[PDB]
Each structure stands twice: as C-alpha cells, then as structure tokens.
Amino acid sequence: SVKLAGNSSLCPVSGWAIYSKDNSVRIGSKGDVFVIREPFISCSPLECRTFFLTQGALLNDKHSNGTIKDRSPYRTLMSCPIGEVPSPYNSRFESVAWSASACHDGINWLTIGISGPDNGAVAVLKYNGIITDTIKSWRNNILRTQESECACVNGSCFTVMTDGPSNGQASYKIFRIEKGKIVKSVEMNAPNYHYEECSCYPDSSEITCVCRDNWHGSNRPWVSFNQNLEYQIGYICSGIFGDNPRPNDKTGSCGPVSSNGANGVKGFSFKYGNGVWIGRTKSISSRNGFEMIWDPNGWTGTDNNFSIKQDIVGINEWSGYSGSFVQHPELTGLDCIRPCFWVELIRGRPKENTIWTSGSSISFCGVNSDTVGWSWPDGAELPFTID
Amino acid sequence: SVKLAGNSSLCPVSGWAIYSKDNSVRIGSKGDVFVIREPFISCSPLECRTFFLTQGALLNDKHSNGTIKDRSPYRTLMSCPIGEVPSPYNSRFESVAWSASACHDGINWLTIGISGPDNGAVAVLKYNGIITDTIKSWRNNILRTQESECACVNGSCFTVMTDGPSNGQASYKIFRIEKGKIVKSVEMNAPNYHYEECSCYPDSSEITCVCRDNWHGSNRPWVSFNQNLEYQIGYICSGIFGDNPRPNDKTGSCGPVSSNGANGVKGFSFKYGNGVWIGRTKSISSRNGFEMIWDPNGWTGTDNNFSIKQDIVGINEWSGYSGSFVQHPELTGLDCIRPCFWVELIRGRPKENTIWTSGSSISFCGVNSDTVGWSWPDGAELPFTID
Amino acid sequence: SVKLAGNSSLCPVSGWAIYSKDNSVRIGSKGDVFVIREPFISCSPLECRTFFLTQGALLNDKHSNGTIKDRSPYRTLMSCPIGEVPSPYNSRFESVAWSASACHDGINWLTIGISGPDNGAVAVLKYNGIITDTIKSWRNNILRTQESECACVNGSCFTVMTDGPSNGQASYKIFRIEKGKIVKSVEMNAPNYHYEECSCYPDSSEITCVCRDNWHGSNRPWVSFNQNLEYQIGYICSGIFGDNPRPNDKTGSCGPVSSNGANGVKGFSFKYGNGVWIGRTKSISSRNGFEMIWDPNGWTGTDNNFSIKQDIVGINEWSGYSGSFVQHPELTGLDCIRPCFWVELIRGRPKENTIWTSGSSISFCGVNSDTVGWSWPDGAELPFTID
Amino acid sequence: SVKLAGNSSLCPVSGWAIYSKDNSVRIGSKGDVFVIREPFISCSPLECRTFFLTQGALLNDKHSNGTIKDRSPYRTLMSCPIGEVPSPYNSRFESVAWSASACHDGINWLTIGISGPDNGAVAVLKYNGIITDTIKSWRNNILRTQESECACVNGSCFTVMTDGPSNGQASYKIFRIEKGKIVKSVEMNAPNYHYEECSCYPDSSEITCVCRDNWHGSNRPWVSFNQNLEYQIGYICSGIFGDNPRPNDKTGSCGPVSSNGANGVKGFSFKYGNGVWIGRTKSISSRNGFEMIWDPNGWTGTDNNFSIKQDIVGINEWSGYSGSFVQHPELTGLDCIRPCFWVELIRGRPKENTIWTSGSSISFCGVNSDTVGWSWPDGAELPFTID
Numbered sequence A, B, C, D: 001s002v003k004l005a006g007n008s009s010l011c012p013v014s015g016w017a018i019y020s021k022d023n024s025v026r027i028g029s030k031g032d033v034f035v036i037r038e039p040f041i042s043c044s045p046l047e048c049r050t051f052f053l054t055q056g057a058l059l060n061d062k063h064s065n066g067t068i069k070d071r072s073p074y075r076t077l078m079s080c081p082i083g084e085v086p087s088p089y090n091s092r093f094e095s096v097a098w099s100a101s102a103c104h105d106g107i108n109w110l111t112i113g114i115s116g117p118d119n120g121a122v123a124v125l126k127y128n129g130i131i132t133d134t135i136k137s138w139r140n141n142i143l144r145t146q147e148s149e150c151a152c153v154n155g156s157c158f159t160v161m162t163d164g165p166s167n168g169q170a171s172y173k174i175f176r177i178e179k180g181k182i183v184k185s186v187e188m189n190a191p192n193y194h195y196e197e198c199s200c201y202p203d204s205s206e207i208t209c210v211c212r213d214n215w216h217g218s219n220r221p222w223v224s225f226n227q228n229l230e231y232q233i234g235y236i237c238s239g240i241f242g243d244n245p246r247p248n249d250k251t252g253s254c255g256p257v258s259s260n261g262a263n264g265v266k267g268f269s270f271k272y273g274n275g276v277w278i279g280r281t282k283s284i285s286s287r288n289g290f291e292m293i294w295d296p297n298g299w300t301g302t303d304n305n306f307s308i309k310q311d312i313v314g315i316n317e318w319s320g321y322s323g324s325f326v327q328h329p330e331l332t333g334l335d336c337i338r339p340c341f342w343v344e345l346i347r348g349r350p351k352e353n354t355i356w357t358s359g360s361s362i363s364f365c366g367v368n369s370d371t372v373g374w375s376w377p378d379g380a381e382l383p384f385t386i387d
C-alpha cells in the first residue's frame, strides 16, 4: 500500500465514454433497493465505489414517504461497488450522515459524515472505519459539505465545508486532513461569493474545486489551493452558464451572474488552462437533460462560443446532481490523472406525483479515442405501487 | 495475528460521537430482516461486528408472532458488519442461543451461546467456530450471561454468568477462558447483591463489569477482577441512578437502592477513578430516551450533582438495552483503550399494538473533540402490514 | 494446504452439544429460501458447509408445487455456510444432481452429482469445481449415492453407490477417488443385504459406513473397508432398532430384521469397539422425533439394554434424514477425529396439507463435557400462503 | 499471475457432461432475478463466470415489459458465479452494453461493451474494470459483437465485430487486443459471406470462430486466424446443417446454403481436423430442443451421415442461443484445452403469452468418460403473476 502521488496533470480528453449505470429505481420497483440521493463515486488504487445518502428506507415501502426532506437522524452514508444497485444486501455502512464526503489516500478510506441538529451539526471523520476526528458547526446554521469525493495529494486529503445561510453570505472553510485527522484549516475570505456542494479534484499537486452558488450566481464559483491551503477564488467566466436554474446563454461574467442566480444544483467542471469542460443540465429552468461542453477559453473568457458538445441525457429526461471523480495513475497505469464524472437521475418529488424522492446514477470517463452522444435516462415508470 | 495486550488505560473522553445506525425496523418493513433483540457490538483487530439474538423469523411475516418471548429453541446468535441490517443474506451464523456473549482475543472469535431447558441450560463455547467447551446450569434455574461482549486481556477472555432467581438472591460466577477453554472460574460471594446482564470491559490489565440488579436495586452493581479472578464488588454510589425503573435523582447509596429496585434493564457505565460515565434512559419508569452523564465523583460519591449531560435519544422515543464495547489500540493505533457503547431501540410489544417485538441499534464512540446531543430514534412507523 | 491424515481414532464422547440450526422453513415463509431436501454437512480444514439438493424453486412460490418428487432435471447440489438459510443470494453452485455426496481432502472440495434418466444416470465428479471424472449406471436402475459426506484418508476419498431395485436385491459398489479421479472400485458381494444412503466416516485410517436397508431390514446394515477397498459387511446387532419404520425394541439380529423391514430412512451410527452411538427417530412408524442412544455392546450384542439416551427432537415434532459428519484434527487441533451429526426436519408432504415438501436442519457435535437433552424442532407454521 | 499460453490442442472428447444449471426463470418467479438474455460463460485461471445482458429490470415486475427488445440505454453487461441466478445481490457490474464479449488473459478480465445509437454505437473496452480503449461504428449500422467469450493466446485476446445490414452484405473485422488496448485489426475480405455472433476459441496458438449467417446461409460460416490476424474463411460443409431455421438434413455445401438461409441463431461448433462437433436445435424451424452431433468429416465433407448424437434439450422444450467456452490447462491441470458449451433457454415472447422475455442457462464440458443424453429444460411455468 502506497499513498497517491497526485502530482501529475489532468489527462486532456476529447470525449466521454460511458462507465456505469445502476438502474436503481427500475430495479427497486420489486427488489430491495435503498431510497437514496446525493450519490457520488470515488476510487481507491484497487476499485471504484458508489457512495450515497440513504433515507433509512427502501423503494416502494411506506417508509419512503416524505423522502423529499434533506436532513433527518435516519440518513446514513453507505457505499457499494460501482454499477450495482444500493441494497441492504450489498452495501457497506460508512457513517450516520445527512451530508457527506469520502476519498482514498492510497492506504485507507476517509469518510466524512455530518449529522445532528441544524444549529450544532457535527462532522464525524473516519479513517479505515475508525473515528479519528470531529468538527462542529461554527456558525450554527447547517454545517454541510461536498456530497462528492474529497481530493488527495501525497497522504493529505482536502475538502470544503460551508456553514451559514443558503440564500445569502455564508462562511466557507478548506480543510487539510491526514490519516483522518484535521491538521490545518482556513476560512476563505470571499465576500459576495457563495460556495456549496463543491466538486474537487487534484491536478499537478494542487486542488481545484467547482461549486454551487445558491445565493446570486447562475455561473459556478471556484476555489483552488495548494497543500498549504494557499488559495485563489473566482467564478467561471464562460457565457455558457453552468448552474440550474440559469439564463439563456449570453455574455458571462468573472463574478456572480445575478440573473436567475438564486437556487441551483450541485455540478462540476474541469479546468484545462484557459479552457473548461462544462457539465450541465439541458434545461435552463428544471433539472432535465445533461450535456458535456468543451469551451477552449471558457474559464476566463466571457463569450458563449464553444467547440464540442456531447449529449448525455435527453432534454425531456430527468437529471439532477452531478460531480467529478478521478482515477489516479496508481489505479490506471497511465501517466496522468484521468477525469471522470457521475450524474444523479432524480425521480419522484417535487416534479412527479409520488410520495417519495430517489435517484439512480450514470457515470462516464474521459478518453481520447472515439465517443458518441446519446441519452442514458433513469427509465423507471412512475408512479409506483406505494405511489 | 497477535493477541490483544489489554494493558493500557481507558481513554478519557469529553463526549460521544455517533458511530453507527442500522435502521433495521424501518428497512424490515419491506426487506428481509431478522426479528432480533439483545444486539451488541464487539471488535477484532480488523473490524467491528454487530451480534444479535434472532427469533428465527423475519419482520412482517407471521412467524414473528409472539416474539416478545425471551427463550425458545429457535433463537440463534448471529452477527453482521456494524451498521448493516441483520438479514439472512448478510449475517454469519454463530451459535444456537437464547442468551449469549462474544469477544475477540486478537487471534480468533470466542462465542458463548446458551440453549436448552430452563432447568438444565448449557452454554456452548466456540473458538473460531469450533466447539471447545460447555458449561451446564449449576442451580437449574435459567443459566444466563452478558448479552454483550466479553473482555479480553493477554490471550484470556472473561465473562460473568448467573443461575437462579431473577427476583431474589441468585448465584454469580466469573470465568476465565483461553482459546475457548474454561481454565478457571469462581463463584462471587455476594449476599444481598444481584447481578444480571453484565457489561464488562478491560482497563489496565483488569476487568470491570457494570450490571443489572433485578432484585432490589435501582442503582447498578459492579464487579472488578484481575486475570487471576481476585475480585471486588460494590454498587455505583451516585444519586444519579442508572437502572430502569428507578426513583427521581436524590441521595444515593453504595449498596442496593431498594426504591423502585425490582425489575430493570441491561446497561453499562465507565469508571474513571472516583468518576463515572453513566448511560441511562431518560424516563425513570419506562424504556424511553437515552442520555450520557459524566459524574466526576459518582462511582464513590452519593450526591446527585453531575457535570456533563449529552442527549442520545429523546424522552418520547423508545430505547431499551445498552452496553459497552471497546476498541483496542491494536485496532485504532491509539495508546489507550477507547470506550464505545450501543443502544437497542425496542419496537413492538408490550408497549405497542403489534404481534411482534424487535429492535434496531445505534452506537457511539468516546472522543475528546467537539460533539453534540440529539435524538437518533428507531423511526419505524407501527403497526406493520402483518400487524 | 495439506491433505487430511485420517489416521487417528474417533473421539470418545459422552454427549452431544448443539452446533447449528438454520430455521430455513420459518424464514422461507417471507424470505427467498430454496425448497430443499437431503441436506448434509461437510468440513474443510478451514470451515464447515451445508450441502443440499434444491428443487430449483423457492418456498412459498408456485414452482414448489409437487416437490415431493425425488428426481428431476431441475435439482441441483448447492452449498452455504453452516447455520445459514439456503438462499440464491448466499449459496454456491456445486453440480446438477438429484443424488449427491461431497467431501474435502484437505486441499480441495470433491463433489459427486448424479443426474440423467432413471435407466442411465451419470455421476459427475468435480475437484475444485472442475469436472474430473464420470461414472455411469451399471444396472440401469437409478444410480444413487450417500446424500451425505464422503470420507477422506491421506489424499484419497471414498464413497458408496447403489444401482438396482429399492425393494429387493441390488448392486453396491465402493469407490476410491483421488483428486476427483476414480482410481479403484469394487462391487460388494452382499447377497440378502441392501445398502442405500450410507453415512460414512474415517477412523484410524479406515472407513466405516452405516446405511439404509430399504428391502427387508429394520436394523441398519454396515460396511467397513481399508484404503485398498478390502471390506467387511454386517448389520448392527442391537435390539435398539435404528431404522424407520421398525418394530418396538426387542431382541435384535446380526442379519436383516425382517419385521417392518420394508421402506426406511437415511441414518447413521458411530462404532466404538463393540459399542455404538445410535441416532434414530422416536416414532417407530413415522419420521417424528429424534434421539441419541449409547449402547455399549450394541454393535455385536442383540439385547435391547442401553446406557445413555439424549433427546434431540420431541416425539410430536417432525424429523427426517440424518447423517454423520466429522471434524478432523487439522481443523480442531485435537488429537482425534470428532464425530458430529445433522438432522433434516422435513415439513410438508406427505404428512401435512401443502403442495410442497422441504426441510430445515440442526446439527450437533460430540463432546465429553456437560450436555443436555431437549427438543429443537423446525417450528414453521403450515400451511403457507401458497399452500 | 501468468498469462494463458493457449498453445496446446483441443482435448478430443467422446461426449458431454452437464456442468451447470441456474434455474433462473423458475427462481425469478419469487426471487429478485434479472431479466436477461445472451448469457455466456468465460473462465479465468481460478474460476468460471456467467456473463449476461440485463434489461435493467427484474422478473415479475412491470419494468420487464417489452423486454423482447434487443437494444436500449438500460441494458448492462454483468456477471455472476456459474450456476447461480443473476441477481442484483450477487452480480458484478461490468459495462453498459446491448452487445458484448469478455475473456480472461490469465492476468485480468477484458470486457467489451457496446452502447449508444444504432448509427454510431461505441464499443467500450475495459481491462480489470478500467476503460482502456474504444472503437466506434465504421458503417453506422449497429456495431455488434460475439455475445460470447473472446479468445486469448499468450497475452493477446481476439474478437470479431460486425457493422452493416443483418439481411445483406455487411462488414466484418477481427481485432487483436493486449491489456485492453487494440493493437491491430483487419477487415475480412468476405464477399457473399455473412458473419454475426461468432463463437471463438483458441487451439494450438490459433483462433477458430464459428458464427451466424443471417443473410442467406443455413449452414454456419467460419473464420480462423493466427496471432498476426492472417485469416482463412469458409462454411461448414456438413449436410447436418447447424443454423436455425434450416432445411431437413441433405447434401451440404462449402458455401452458404441458401435454403432457409435468412434469419438464424447464435451457435457454435468445434473443429477436429476434418471432423466437427455440432451443437444445434432439434427443430429445423424454431428455437426448440438441443443436441450435440459428432460428424467425423463434417468440416469439409458435404454428406449428411454422422457418428454420434447426444440429446441435451427435448424437441418440445424451448432453447435459444448457444456458444462455446474453454477451460485452459492453467485452470484444469490438463495438457490440452478443454471444450465446453452453454445453452440459453429462452422463455416468454414471442412464442409465449407474456409481457417479457428472458432466459435461463445450462452448460456442459467435454469428456472421454461415460455420458448420457437427456433433457434439461428451463422448467418455468408461464405466464407469471405480472403476465
């Protein structure tokens, strides 16, 4: 067992090849499948796993009632092999949590699970399944984290947490964690910025995070930092707006785009110099469809021109949260860090006439060989027997 | 593989961080989940497992009928990974038993399973799944044991068993077991004492047990002993009474507190010099709620003042049995033995209008970082389809 | 990995301690549990497994209809950890078979599965899951084997097969198998004898088999042989008749006891010098109850006196097939071969008003410490929803 | 771990011994079993696995509706241990695919999964679960592959793919793959030939494929090639026609037999010099029954005489696709490559009045010891509760 280096560059990619699909909701119609949301993928030097937040209930059972609710003492972080349905019979317990993150440093798994009351939530950190540290809410207003994988470089793993209003200025902190122990943290000095549900990845020994501004931006904010937590902040400049909801594409801004800026969805983007791979919904108003767009100067340029678009989910099909995950050379045998992403396909409330809300997942990995756009939707027929 | 040393002290702790929650009853509404009671946790140098006594039946099935009954030829000891639901598809068979204990000596698992008739029950000892010894009832009146983990020190494991009345003077024996073989035992000379369902843990090469007086004590009896079984006995002196039922907190006694002393519930406490961490229900009369209380002189002092209280389960929510379990430095990498505990959340009879009785579980581990009180209840909606 | 020696003696035992109980039928009421019969246990140097013949159907499903039938192209030999319910989710596939045997030589598993038509059945031998040999019916009349574990000594495993009438003189052969290859066989010269469903075990480098005479004996026939297949034959002389049905106990015979000799049930017995441990039903007419009897001169003596009786299943409770299995010193660390046994508890047809027939199991191991008699019945409530 | 040599000859065999049967459809009546088609078996140096294409739905659930359809974004390649039912609880996710192949090179698994639109499908190659390459449709007309195992020789694995019409001249390419990377390919110059769903196996360092002519041949086309992809092509000459549908047996041809040549079914054959082992349906017009036929000069001779016939599935029972798979000496310890085969037993549409279509499987391995013909059918009772 050797810790991940994290010192190579991101693999440049021309397209995205489909990696997994679990068909969770379709199967859950009869099978014993957890009601879940906020799934995310993370890899070790040996395997890739799907993490998810359960509602402590199964699909098509009465206890799935009212699962549109985000937080409760019943939610737990669990994981299963990628591509498999999240079931009590194949899932590993990770932590009690209504907000979470996880990642592998090359030696062991780190998991971060937040639970407790809105006014004093506590993040429990585990390393190899053993509690190693905790961190308590410092603003007493819903301590919350990535809902995707943390990023690891040379034995240290990094994450971002938010505490405060989701409709105004909040507080954002970056953490450096070693063997499950917080060794350093810093509060981001970011007035007029808003950070939630960051998707973070390593690249050339440094961390880049693309996040969600729930306050007043329809473009996505970002934060990057080295291992010493020396950071920079900004917003993606592209007129190809990445959040949902958002305005129709037009001239962008290197600051928060106020038009349709309230609300949002977890997302991600991959930075390559001044360019950016943007993953976003197809609809500007609802969580429908998904597409990958290559914009060669979109990180710093404000125009709405782009070079490549690849369809992932049709515009008439349900999508939801999305996030980045990487495969390290230690796993692939490549000489660079390979970018991948996952998409949550949300079914149920509030858009459909059910008593429940749950999601299935698809994932893709970046390649330089031939690829194709299509639609890989959830495919479940609602409502269910329970409703 | 190396045997656990068990020679370090208990880690001092300031609070308790949530470690697991299985949501068993909620999931069992649809899923294939055992009807269980008396769950308990025990760890090896590699992993932690939940042990439990099944009724040889699944939730929401007709065979769950009359499972309020404690003893039958159908009950078996089984185990599964911590935090997972006890299902026939993920559970390991341990022993046929209606009373049980288990612990890992660093090399292999020891399980103790008692079955047979009330007037001649036999405890079957297994080491690495192989029968290694038996011990038969010596008072012919329901031979019974911990219903939680035994305690191991330097290759020897220790447990306590009781035989005789549950409403009067009985007989209590301590056992030393090596590789599943009883190498020594001694009967405790404890007139006017009553010991049942002991929660035992190792601390500085010696064993401490906190138990249940079902005869005439609303405070908890304790027994401690070295590897040679040289023992001491007493009662927790704190006016913060630990049993259920019990009187309102007042001046305590270093002997059995007779007020509300009959009946009781399995519980635990952690000794730290003259101080004590007490886990107990919130209700004085019923198995509802749960809390952890730090009383700096409560082991030997009779006053009812305490320093710390942490909420675990709300007073309006069902609780039940609770017990200690520890994580050895061989597992954690710490330089002390870490205290943890589990709580059984009992649903169904006799308090609820169902045909069945079963429990789910939560567990916590002691830390010195920030923690928070809350309520992590079972959360199931009764009655069920079967009733 | 080292092959089992099989050169030590059987462990003398004073009683039987309960080892496992699966509660298969109770759980199968709701859970996904195979309809099975002819379960048997067999051990490796590492673990013990339950083998069984499925009907290719689950309990409480329509395909369990008519499962009173013994042979079909749908029956398969499968195995699961001892004490666990036989489910498609925890069971390993072994072979297609309506008659079977299996055993571990210390290195790998040998399985023998017979399938095909009544007039030309073929036994398929597998070693480590790879087909290594076959043997075809030589009398064209239902080739059939032990339905319990084969016996292994120093890298060779031994079994017995029958071909011919089940109500008259048939043909019986002993086989020596090495790494799944038949290296020697011999036909037993046994006129007026009848051998079916032999329970065989190793003892001091030789094999002893106690079997079922379905033709004209209410006592059990036996055959013993060395590694070169030099054999001896006889019948258990004890007036404590072991088969079912049978007459009331009286003066026995060293030949087949004709009274109530037709029909029968698979069983076993352990030989100790002139003495014998006899396992049998409690009823003389039906497959009900079970008991272990120590008869110090019952192997060669014809009286009906005995020294020890231990209750296993109550007379009013269903029992069925039973068989021996052993635990080698390589597994236990003992200096002798430990005798164990299993009992099949048959529910359904023809005794009960269902459409199906299936069994659960219990098992016990021989010890010299204290034990107790009791009743550990199936405990399922019939009929089921499917009927 | 060492790569498979693949340099020995095929083991000559006189008959076929039954190896596995999963009873999938029977069990799926109640159990949680995938709706599947196109199952196939492939082995490593350690184990044999069943691969299959799911419809992302379970039997007896509403989502099984319209599963007669071959292609969709919901279909995935998964695998489970041979002989076990394909369940979400025991199946490993491999790839998103509506056409697939897989094989083990001695070190890791190679999987090939094709998904995407009919006019631009993309094959995703994975080595040890990691995407290693892609290949895109070159004729824009349903890129498709074996639906059985690829063949490996000395670290290189080989497969065949087709692009173009299924009712006329198409394009056929052979691929050489090393560690999941395409290192060479060549288009077959085969005017008037049609290749689909090839069954390929290694033999003396070279690859032989027997395939399906869906255009105008009732006999099967073949292609063989060395590691450098230098190939030869032809048709099986035997008047014992191997496809379905087909004419009654008569004089054959070394070219495509036009009579009943349109349409077909995936199948296989084993070449032995001028002789051939032919597996085929019993019905000439429908997918019913299955038999193995040894024709000593059937590879190059056009007569309709044969030497051996062995019944596998009765003519009145449903069959379906069939394919070859081999066990290498690295797995068996033999000095030759052992031939095995599997048969898909298709139930439901279009031949039966259900809303769904699915298959179970049986498999056999070649031996030189005694064997027997019989019928090992699916055995499910249709329709189901869902219909």
Ligand SMILES: *[C@@H]1O[C@H](CO)[C@@H](O[C@@H]2O[C@H](CO)[C@@H](O[C@H]3O[C@H](CO)[C@@H](O)[C@H](O[C@H]4O[C@H](CO)[C@@H](O)[C@H](O)[C@@H]4O)[C@@H]3O)[C@H](O)[C@H]2NC(C)=O)[C@H](O)[C@H]1NC(C)=O
Residues within 6 Å of the ligand: A061, A062, A065, A066, A355, A386
């Ligand atoms: C998921 O949650 C949904 C929201 O709760 C459930 O729907 C609700 O179902 C309840 C129970 O039937 C229903 O309850 C009330 O309102 C009734 C009129 O609409 C009223 O008649 C009920 O009260 C009367 O009866 C009760 C019981 O006897 C008495 O205690 C009262 O005093 C009175 O006599 C009761 O107030 C809701 O109307 C309904 N809500 C909605 C929005 O439909 C789903 O049932 C649940 N699904 C599952 C599968 O569990």
Ligand SMILES: *[C@@H]1O[C@H](CO)[C@@H](O[C@@H]2O[C@H](CO)[C@@H](O[C@H]3O[C@H](CO)[C@@H](O)[C@H](O[C@H]4O[C@H](CO)[C@@H](O)[C@H](O)[C@@H]4O)[C@@H]3O)[C@H](O)[C@H]2NC(C)=O)[C@H](O)[C@H]1NC(C)=O
Residues within 6 Å of the ligand: C061, C062, C065, C066, C355, C386
């Ligand atoms: C387990 O197997 C049991 C034995 O088969 C089943 O019980 C049987 O159920 C069948 C179907 O209902 C039933 O069938 C026949 O007999 C009827 C009179 O008893 C007769 O009316 C039926 O025939 C008529 O209808 C059919 C269909 O429309 C026509 O084809 C006929 O021409 C005629 O009009 C039919 O002959 C058996 O009576 C019954 N047997 C017994 C012993 O009860 C169970 O149903 C089965 N259980 C499960 C769960 O599958």
Ligand SMILES: *[C@@H]1O[C@H](CO)[C@@H](O)[C@H](O)[C@H]1NC(C)=O
Residues within 6 Å of the ligand: A005, A007, A008
């Ligand atoms: C990346 O890290 C590895 C492991 O420490 C190191 O050997 C290598 O030199 C680094 N790569 C570069 C380009 O510096």
Ligand SMILES: *[C@@H]1O[C@H](CO)[C@@H](O)[C@H](O)[C@H]1NC(C)=O
Residues within 6 Å of the ligand: B005, B007, B008
């Ligand atoms: C405890 O045992 C350890 C491990 O063998 C030993 O090294 C150490 O000396 C002991 N500690 C104490 C306090 O005696």
Ligand SMILES: *[C@@H]1O[C@H](CO)[C@@H](O)[C@H](O)[C@H]1NC(C)=O
Residues within 6 Å of the ligand: B065, B066, B355
């Ligand atoms: C539950 O079991 C008891 C005891 O046998 C029985 O009296 C009662 O009728 C059962 N209840 C139901 C609802 O079946």
Ligand SMILES: *[C@@H]1O[C@H](CO)[C@@H](O)[C@H](O)[C@H]1NC(C)=O
Residues within 6 Å of the ligand: C005, C007, C008
């Ligand atoms: C039994 O077999 C073992 C292993 O071959 C051998 O070492 C030993 O001598 C044998 N025991 C006796 C009593 O001969």
Ligand SMILES: *[C@@H]1O[C@H](CO)[C@@H](O)[C@H](O)[C@H]1NC(C)=O
Residues within 6 Å of the ligand: D005, D007, D008
């Ligand atoms: C096949 O390869 C093996 C294994 O490396 C080699 O030893 C042997 O020489 C080869 N056999 C033939 C027939 O060439």
Ligand SMILES: *[C@@H]1O[C@H](CO)[C@@H](O)[C@H](O)[C@H]1NC(C)=O
Residues within 6 Å of the ligand: D065, D066, D355
């Ligand atoms: C099955 O699916 C088809 C296609 O959507 C639909 O037309 C049909 O109504 C469905 N059948 C049933 C019984 O639901």
Ligand SMILES: [Ca+2]
Residues within 6 Å of the ligand: none
């Ligand atoms: Ca079910």
Ligand SMILES: [Ca+2]
Residues within 6 Å of the ligand: A212, A213, A214, A215, A216, A217, A218, A219, A243, A244, A245, A260, A261, A262, A263, A264, A265
């Ligand atoms: Ca926004």
Ligand SMILES: [Ca+2]
Residues within 6 Å of the ligand: A238, A295, A296, A297, A298, A301, A303, A304, A305, A306
């Ligand atoms: Ca641009």
Ligand SMILES: [Ca+2]
Residues within 6 Å of the ligand: B212, B213, B214, B215, B216, B217, B218, B219, B243, B244, B245, B260, B261, B262, B263, B264, B265
């Ligand atoms: Ca009390």
Ligand SMILES: [Ca+2]
Residues within 6 Å of the ligand: B238, B295, B296, B297, B298, B301, B303, B304, B305, B306
């Ligand atoms: Ca005090």
Ligand SMILES: [Ca+2]
Residues within 6 Å of the ligand: C212, C213, C214, C215, C216, C217, C218, C219, C243, C244, C245, C260, C261, C262, C263, C264, C265
């Ligand atoms: Ca008889």
Ligand SMILES: [Ca+2]
Residues within 6 Å of the ligand: C238, C295, C296, C297, C298, C301, C303, C304, C305, C306
């Ligand atoms: Ca006698």
Ligand SMILES: [Ca+2]
Residues within 6 Å of the ligand: D212, D213, D214, D215, D216, D217, D218, D219, D243, D244, D245, D260, D261, D262, D263, D264, D265
């Ligand atoms: Ca054809």
